[PDB]
Amino acid sequence: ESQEDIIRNIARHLAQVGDSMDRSIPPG
């Protein structure tokens, strides 16, 4: 309900979906 709570939720959601979209392969 707080502004900072909303902020934290959005950023967390963005970060998690972002990671699901991370296509990089670590170097060998």
Next chain:
Amino acid sequence: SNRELVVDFLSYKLSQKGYSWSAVKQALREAGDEFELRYRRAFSDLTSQLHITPGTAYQSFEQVVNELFRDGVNWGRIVAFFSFGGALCVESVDKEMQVLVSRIAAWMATYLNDHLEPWIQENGGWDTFVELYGNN
């Protein structure tokens, strides 16, 4: 160039909602579309709950994005950054604050240039982004 990417992406997202703002770009557009599909299957759009206003938009932008990248950076989180900007612009135009579109674009470009550029260059630049996300 980063600024160019930003304006192209935001203009694309705006056009998809019927609004109008008058290889990398294509990959980013597609990545954004996929990102948004995945997002909608998982979480509600909380953009509205931010209460975007001219006086608060930068602070909302800055706090979300700082939190997004606090733990680290990857290409997926960079796509999230672009999609988030897109959402802020659509909300802005929806609520007749369309002047915020040009400000959000500039804020995004500056954040890329000042804060993400070092990581981008360390990880092969946008050329590597296209190798990974191109044609999708």
